[PDB]
Design a protein around this ligand. Sequence first.
Ligand SMILES: COc1cc(F)c(F)c(Nc2ccc(I)cc2F)c1NS(=O)(=O)C1(C[C@H](O)CO)CC1
Ligand SMILES: Nc1ncnc2c1ncn2[C@@H]1O[C@H](COP(=O)(O)OP(=O)(O)OP(=O)(O)O)[C@@H](O)[C@H]1O
Ligand SMILES: [Mg+2]
Length: 291
Amino acid sequence: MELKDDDFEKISELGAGNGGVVFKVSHKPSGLVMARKLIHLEIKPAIRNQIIRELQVLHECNSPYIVGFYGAFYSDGEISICMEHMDGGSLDQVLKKAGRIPEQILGKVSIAVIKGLTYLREKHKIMHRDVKPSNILVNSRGEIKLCDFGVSGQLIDSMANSVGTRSYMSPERLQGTHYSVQSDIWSMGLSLVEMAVGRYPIPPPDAKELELMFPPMAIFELLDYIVNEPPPKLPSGVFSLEFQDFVNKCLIKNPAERADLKQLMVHAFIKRSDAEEVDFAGWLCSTIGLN
Ligand SMILES: COc1cc(F)c(F)c(Nc2ccc(I)cc2F)c1NS(=O)(=O)C1(C[C@H](O)CO)CC1
Ligand SMILES: Nc1ncnc2c1ncn2[C@@H]1O[C@H](COP(=O)(O)OP(=O)(O)OP(=O)(O)O)[C@@H](O)[C@H]1O
Ligand SMILES: [Mg+2]
């Protein structure tokens, strides 16, 4: 069935970002509850047609580690991207109510992220380009899925002019155009540290700050740090030695020396997390009071 603007009904607002706003809506014809993202674009109708046409490949992106897609269309002054509603929300959301996310859970999260990235690259030859806590969704069924990946080249271009203070961009991507899939690994690493420590990893916390846990920097000040200062390490002692090595392999400034999906897939931290028996659904639901 084809999605149409008048066939929807707003229920509430799931949130908003710099690029658009997403509502929890009901698709009356099917009775199915969906997440509808609205992206206001003040651009010619010809180009928007290309965008809507490029978003269609989303129907071919079927994976347990990727947010389900229902359809994309243009309504009145904005394109709509309709997707599966994840009652658990984004990790950055659960990160707030949780304050911090256990290494056990992060291991499962890491597996889903790696597999999602791997799927996108192997079966669709595309990189995410925007991996960060807010683009990792989870539901009461325990599923962990990636969303907001660059499927439409045209959309990427029309969004080239916004950003935001806190950046998850790799050093190579911040410096130039000489970046690719490896750039996503850096983002995952940084996102893991954030979720593991309880706040944006840069600048790193001091001895006194860590002891407590266990003003924002200026635009240039933060980017200069990322590019020149050494990468964010994970606090030793409170976290596993395998997990520490995992993020380290992720946060290597040089993209060619940095670990890739293939390597991380068979890394000690993943093998270990893979075997571990963790009840993500239970944790996710109790921490955010859902189930
Ligand atoms: C250009 O990125 C993008 C380029 C694309 F081709 C996309 F299809 C998207 N969005 C997107 C991708 C997969 C699913 I399942 C659901 C979605 F909503 C974005 N990301 S985004 O919707 O969050 C976006 C940019 C974002 O706000 C900047 O961080 C465009 C508004
Ligand atoms: N399919 C979905 N199901 C449930 N909630 C969602 C879904 N998609 C997005 N959201 C919620 O909507 C919020 C806004 O999403 P959006 O992608 O527009 O911005 P963002 O990723 O938070 O930030 P930015 O665009 O600035 O990087 C998210 O934080 C998330 O909690
Ligand atoms: Mg997002």
